[PDB]
Amino acid sequence: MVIATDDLEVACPKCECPACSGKGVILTAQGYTLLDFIQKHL
Amino acid sequence: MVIATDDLEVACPKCCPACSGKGVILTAQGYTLLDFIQKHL
Amino acid sequence: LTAQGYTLLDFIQKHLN
Amino acid sequence: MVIATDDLEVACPKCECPACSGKGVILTAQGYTLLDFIQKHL
Amino acid sequence: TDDLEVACPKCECPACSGKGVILTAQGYTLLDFIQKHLN
Amino acid sequence: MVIATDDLEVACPKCCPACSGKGVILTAQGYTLLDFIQKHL
Amino acid sequence: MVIATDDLEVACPKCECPACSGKGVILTAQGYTLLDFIQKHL
Amino acid sequence: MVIATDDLEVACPKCCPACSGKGVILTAQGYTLLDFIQKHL
Amino acid sequence: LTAQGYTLLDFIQKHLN
Amino acid sequence: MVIATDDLEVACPKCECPACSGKGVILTAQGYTLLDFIQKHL
Amino acid sequence: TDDLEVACPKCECPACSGKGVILTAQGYTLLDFIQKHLN
Amino acid sequence: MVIATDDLEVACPKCCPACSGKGVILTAQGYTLLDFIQKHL
Amino acid sequence: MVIATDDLEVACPKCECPACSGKGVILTAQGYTLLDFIQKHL
Amino acid sequence: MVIATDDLEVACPKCCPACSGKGVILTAQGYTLLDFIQKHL
Amino acid sequence: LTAQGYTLLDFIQKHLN
Amino acid sequence: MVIATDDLEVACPKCCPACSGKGVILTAQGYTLLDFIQKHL
Amino acid sequence: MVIATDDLEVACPKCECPACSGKGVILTAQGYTLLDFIQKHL
Amino acid sequence: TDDLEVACPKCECPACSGKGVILTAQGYTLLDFIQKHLN
Amino acid sequence: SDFVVIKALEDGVNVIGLTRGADTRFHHSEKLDKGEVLIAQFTEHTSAIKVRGKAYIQTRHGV
Amino acid sequence: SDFVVIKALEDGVNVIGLTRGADTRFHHSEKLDKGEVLIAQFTEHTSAIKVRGKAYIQTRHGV
Amino acid sequence: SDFVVIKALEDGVNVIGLTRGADTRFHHSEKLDKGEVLIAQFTEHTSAIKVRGKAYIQTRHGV
Amino acid sequence: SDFVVIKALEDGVNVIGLTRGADTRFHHSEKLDKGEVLIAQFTEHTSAIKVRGKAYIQTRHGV
Amino acid sequence: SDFVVIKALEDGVNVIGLTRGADTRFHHSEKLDKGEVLIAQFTEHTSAIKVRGKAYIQTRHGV
Amino acid sequence: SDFVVIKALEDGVNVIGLTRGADTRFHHSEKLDKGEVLIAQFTEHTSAIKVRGKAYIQTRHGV
Amino acid sequence: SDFVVIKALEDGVNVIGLTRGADTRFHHSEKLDKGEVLIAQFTEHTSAIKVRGKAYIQTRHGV
Amino acid sequence: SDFVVIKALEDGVNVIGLTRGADTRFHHSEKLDKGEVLIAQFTEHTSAIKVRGKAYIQTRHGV
Amino acid sequence: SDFVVIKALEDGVNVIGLTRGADTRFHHSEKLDKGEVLIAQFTEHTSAIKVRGKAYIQTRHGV
Amino acid sequence: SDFVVIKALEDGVNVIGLTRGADTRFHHSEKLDKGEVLIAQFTEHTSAIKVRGKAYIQTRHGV
Amino acid sequence: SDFVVIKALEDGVNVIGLTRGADTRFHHSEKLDKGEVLIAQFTEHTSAIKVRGKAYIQTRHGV
Amino acid sequence: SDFVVIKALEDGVNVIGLTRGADTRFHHSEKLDKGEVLIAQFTEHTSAIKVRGKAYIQTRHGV
Ligand SMILES: N[C@@H](Cc1c[nH]c2ccccc12)C(=O)O
């Protein structure tokens, strides 16, 4: 709703890979926020 | 709030074949979070 | 944890894998 | 008129097998009800 | 099953002819249907 | 009674090629039960 | 009109063959009636 | 009657190419009988 | 033979083969 | 305007050949009428 | 053919020029047509 | 006369490419006769 | 306008070649008129 | 006259990419003559 | 040459090849 | 001024995925010049 | 807005190459104007 | 080019910073555009 | 893909199906007693429907 | 594919089918007695329908 | 893919499906008690629908 | 595929079929006596229909 | 691909789906309580929809 | 496949068919005497119809 | 392909998507609070939409 | 597949056909004297019709 | 090929695009401040549009 | 394929054809003197028509 | 192939094109000063048009 | 394939063609002086037309 897939990821501007480390794909700040939260409490 | 429990799940109108025993059916917002977490955890 | 915190965590834990 | 196939079965969530016993194919309570009745009286 | 089979009131046998359980109308309905069409 | 006789079968309107000697043509409800019983008996 | 092909034949329920004797196909009473009539007088 | 001569044949509106010398054109009922007899005679 | 008899027979004989 | 090909021929009922003499191809009376006239005067 | 050819009334010959048979208008019509277009 | 001259031929409206030097273009009736004569002469 | 391609050429009625001398194609009077004019003055 | 200069050419509304330096664009009548002359010269 | 003559010739010379 | 700044660029309405970190998305006129310069510089 | 690609180029009429110097690709006056300006100041 | 470059009025140099030619608004507009986006 | 609607207005109405192909026979005749409806498609095997006895007919055309 | 509706308005109405192909013959003639309906498709084998005797006709065009 | 709407207006209305193919049989009959609706497509296996008993019918052709 | 309706309004009406192809002949002529109907398709072999004598004609265009 | 709109006008309305193919069974039945809407396509697996109980129905034909 | 209706309103009306292809000739001319109808399709070999003499013409485009 | 417009007229409106295929489950349920619009296509994976709670619905058929 | 109707309103009307392809020439010019009609299709070889002299023209558009 | 017109009637209107396929997520959300228009097609990757906040919507259906 | 009707309302009207492809030039210009009509198709080689001088124009859209 | 008409009613109107594909970015924005028209097709690379600032919009769906 | 009609209502009207593909440039601009008409198709190479200056525009949608 207020959060979209776009708010979580972004296609690595290089590999349309060292830049994304094979993730193909870079996490946004909002991405980490959720992931760090979940990993610390799961 | 920004995202409630209602926004993520949603219960099973029937109960189960319809929800495949999960007891709840997911919203798009639900999958969005879950797919993101599962792919990066 | 905030209410919003649990909301997310409960959702994830109930559905993960 | 009030009893479909969905009401007598259910695809085994495991194999789309011990869970369904090869049946693929979990029978419902309603399913056995009819089945037990017919087998006992046929 | 209750909506088909009932306990023979005599042997909880001539009354049930050895089945141990009689039958409701709904019972026969299904049984006659399956017997006439099976195999 | 939940399911009837009428639900299950139908008297052949012609009699026989139409019923293939059966004399009774079955409803969808009819086959549903029969296929389920035959498959698991 | 009052007589159709159906009134003369019927696809052998077995071979959709001993049952039809390779005719594929069984004659009705009306079938024989006409054929016996024609063969006896032709 | 059940089936007259008219029901089986029918004459040639032209007479002959149209009927190919047969002198008559057949009805559906005509063929029906003839095909049945020829196949089983 | 009946009239219906001849009707059929005449038809068949005139058209057979 | 009153004379078509159908009026001058006819497909041999035998070969769709002695019957048409290879002609395939029986000529009508009308056919010979014209043909005889033209051949005699050409 | 009658609608084309007629018996030369003289030799049943200068009148028909040896053809043995004269010609109607319809006769010439066809003959002129075929002669002008044949081969 | 049963068939005319007009039935058979037509004066070329242009004269020549249009008639291919023939000066007379033929009707369907024209070809009918001509094809029949040519094929059997 | 008043002159068309048709007014210049014509597909050799033979080769739809000695008749057109491999031109495939015969020149009209109007054709030559223009060509002779141009060749003499070019 | 029968065919003027205007009937053959026509100038370039722009002037050059549009006419490719030719300074003029040809009419259909223009090509007709030119194609005929070039093919037979 | 006539005017019509030049018209054609000028056209051809300006465009040939 | 014949071409402006507005003609060439545009302020990003979102800020970034939308502009790919550029902050300025370009008009057709913009690319026209840029592609021409890049190709021949 | 007033300057297209057509305004900066022109396909070489020779190669659809000395004429365009491989460029394929004759630049317009307008083309060099911009190019010279940018190269001198970049 | 005139619509971009003008002759530095001083050196026909601090005024132009050695370029030999100043710049109009339209000049900068293009130059800033190309410099920010080139390569 | 076309079909005919036949509603029997009296008892014993006949719908006879004629065979698609070089030769034409009555391959199947259906019976309609008053008030019974048959909806029938022209098919691979059937290219002519014949209706015998008083009946109401609806086609791709009109009534 | 197209079809013709023929309702016989009198006894002995004839529907004659002409053959598709280079040559044309009457391959089949159906009989319609007053009030009988025939719905007939133009087919692989049939490319002309001929109607003899008083009858009501419905086609794609009209009546 | 065409379909027929059948609404039973009385009890025991029958919808009988006839088989697509050279031979024609009643391969399935469905039962409709007053007020029950069946929406049925003509299918690979079914090329004729027969309606027995008082019922409301909607087709592409009409009611 | 298009068709023409021809109703003969007088005796001896002619429907002549012209051949599809490079050359054109009268390949078949049908006879229509007053009140007879011919429904004719344009076919692989027939690409021109000619009507001789007083007749009523219905096509895709009009009448 | 065609679809049906079903709005339940009372509690316990049933939408039953019949199987496409040679044999026909109730493969699934959906439940509609008063005021619930189901929009259902005819599918590869479903070629007949049956509606039990008072309901409002919209199709390609009508209502 | 389009077609033209030509009804001759006077005697000696001509329908001339021009050839489809790079070059164009009169390959066939048909004759229509007052009241005669010709229905002609544009074909593989014919791409222009020319009508000479007083006649009534119906096309897809009109009269 | 076809689509449904759903406007929620109250809070907590449910759009539930049923699966295309032999078996039918609720694969996804979307939530619509008063005044929210969902435009939804029938898809490869979705062949039935179920609407729970007061809502305004637009389809190819109507409202 | 499109066509133009040209009716000559005066003598010596010209219909000139221009060639489909990279280059454009007058490939064929037809002549129409008052009252003569030419029905002409745009074809493989012809992609522009030019009409010279007073004439009535009917196109897929209007008059 | 279908599309939706969304005109934001207030600030912060959201158009959320849901993914075509077996599973459904919010793949992209576009923002519309009062008076801004988004014209959006249903696509290979997008099979459901969700509109949040007061906005004017135009679809293949109505308003 | 589409076409434009151009009727010259004055002398010296120009119809200029622009080339289909990456680059655009005037490949052919036709001349129309008052009252002359050109009917022109958009073609493989021509994807823009330019009309110079007072003229009446008919297209698929209007006038 | 659908298209949108955008007429700028004020200065600085923006037409932003969003990318067809799994991920969505503003790949091109065009500028429209009062009274300028842009006619834009949805294309292989563009599947959403965004209009910013007062402007007149025409679509297949409407204004 | 769609096209736009542009009639210049003032001197110096510009029709600019934008490139089909991943990147978008002004590939060609046409000049229209008062009263000149340009009819332009959207093409393999052109997927956006931009009109600068007072002009009358006709499309598939309106004006
Ligand atoms: N196949 C059919 C063709 C047909 C359909 N309707 C007709 C009506 C008349 C004649 C033939 C037909 C047949 O055998 O004849």
Ligand SMILES: N[C@@H](Cc1c[nH]c2ccccc12)C(=O)O
């Ligand atoms: N083979 C075609 C010939 C044909 C079509 N239309 C015609 C009109 C008249 C004469 C013959 C025909 C047929 O039987 O239908």
Ligand SMILES: N[C@@H](Cc1c[nH]c2ccccc12)C(=O)O
């Ligand atoms: N002849 C049809 C099916 C069929 C059989 N009998 C029918 C009666 C009416 C309509 C259709 C049929 C086919 O093979 O495809």
Ligand SMILES: N[C@@H](Cc1c[nH]c2ccccc12)C(=O)O
């Ligand atoms: N071209 C047609 C004959 C034809 C069609 N239209 C015409 C108009 C006039 C003359 C002949 C024709 C054929 O194949 O034989």
Ligand SMILES: N[C@@H](Cc1c[nH]c2ccccc12)C(=O)O
């Ligand atoms: N033939 C369908 C069932 C069916 C369709 N229409 C019918 C009408 C009546 C009875 C059954 C049917 C199937 O595939 O199973």
Ligand SMILES: N[C@@H](Cc1c[nH]c2ccccc12)C(=O)O
């Ligand atoms: N050019 C057309 C046929 C044709 C020749 N001349 C014509 C005159 C008008 C219309 C069509 C034509 C083709 O080859 O297919």
Ligand SMILES: N[C@@H](Cc1c[nH]c2ccccc12)C(=O)O
């Ligand atoms: N697979 C189909 C089954 C179906 C279609 N229509 C139905 C109606 C009722 C029950 C099931 C169905 C679906 O999910 O849509």
Ligand SMILES: N[C@@H](Cc1c[nH]c2ccccc12)C(=O)O
């Ligand atoms: N093939 C035609 C294209 C064309 C048709 N109509 C036109 C009008 C103007 C310019 C070109 C055309 C040509 O050689 O030119």
Ligand SMILES: N[C@@H](Cc1c[nH]c2ccccc12)C(=O)O
């Ligand atoms: N592909 C979509 C299908 C869909 C579109 N609209 C829907 C509405 C409800 C449920 C599913 C859908 C999905 O993942 O779910």
Ligand SMILES: N[C@@H](Cc1c[nH]c2ccccc12)C(=O)O
């Ligand atoms: N190749 C296309 C280019 C084009 C289409 N529409 C345009 C509009 C303006 C400028 C160029 C174009 C043509 O000649 O038609």
Ligand SMILES: N[C@@H](Cc1c[nH]c2ccccc12)C(=O)O
């Ligand atoms: N999903 C579309 C393109 C697309 C991305 N984001 C969108 C938002 C709205 C509409 C379409 C899109 C495709 O891949 O084909």
Ligand SMILES: N[C@@H](Cc1c[nH]c2ccccc12)C(=O)O
């Ligand atoms: N995608 C188009 C350009 C385009 C179409 N619609 C648009 C809307 C806005 C901006 C650009 C566009 C191209 O191929 O280049």
Ligand SMILES: [Zn+2]
């Ligand atoms: Zn007991």
Ligand SMILES: [Zn+2]
């Ligand atoms: Zn039976």
Ligand SMILES: [Zn+2]
């Ligand atoms: Zn003599």
Ligand SMILES: [Zn+2]
């Ligand atoms: Zn000549």
Ligand SMILES: [Zn+2]
């Ligand atoms: Zn940004």
